[PDB]
Design a protein around this nucleic acid. Structure first.
Ligand SMILES: [Mg+2]
Ligand SMILES: [Mg+2]
Ligand SMILES: [Mg+2]
Ligand SMILES: [Mg+2]
Ligand SMILES: [Mg+2]
Length: 117
RNA sequence: GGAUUGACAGAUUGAGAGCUCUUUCUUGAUUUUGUGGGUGGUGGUGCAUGGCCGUUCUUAGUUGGUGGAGUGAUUUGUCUGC
């Protein structure tokens, strides 16, 4: 669901849980750190997503949200001083949640559903 | 899918300075390059200034209010004496 994802990105931006990028994400997944991972499939040459999946096999669950630019936009990378987007382009293309922070019921039901697959 | 940061070892250096290079590794939006602007300056101007001190001047010297003399600038009061 769309709500739980923004909730978890807020709970990990507040307590510094987002591994904003792929090297930090890879290091977190290699360690016992990365508790969640959202990545976009609209990536050229597709090897980064394959590497993310392989590191995920190894901290298991992953999400497959598209729209890398939008993913970064609602991932909190923007300073977003105004109400509207005040930056030309900003993206993440991989986001890893380390610290779960505050917990909401809808989000935990969603992650349990995604774990069940 | 890296604005950037930092560095072992060597060349380089006076340096055990990752200053610069060889290679690579680390770091995460604080930054980096341009514009405006701002700071810092035992930089200049004491002949732009303050404050302070020095000196004229260690002497006894100044000043204005009513009043008098001058058209007036000024003067008397601030003096002949002791
Ligand atoms: Mg100075
Ligand atoms: Mg002077
Ligand atoms: Mg005097
Ligand atoms: Mg008179
Ligand atoms: Mg007189």
């Amino acid at each position: 669901i769309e709500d739980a994802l923004k909730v978890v990105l807020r709970t990990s931006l507040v307590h510094d849980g987002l591994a904003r990028g792929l090297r930090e994400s890879a290091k977190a997944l290699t360690r016992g750190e990365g508790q969640l991972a959202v990545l976009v499939e609209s990536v050229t040459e597709e090897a980064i997503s394959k590497l993310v999946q392989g590191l995920a096999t190894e901290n298991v669950p992953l999400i497959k949200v598209a729209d890398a630019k939008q993913l970064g936009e609602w991932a909190g990378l923007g300073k977003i001083d105004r109400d509207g987007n005040a930056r030309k382009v900003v993206g993440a293309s991989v986001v890893v949640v380390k610290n779960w922070g505050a917990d909401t019921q809808e989000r935990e039901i969603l992650l349990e559903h995604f774990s069940q697959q």
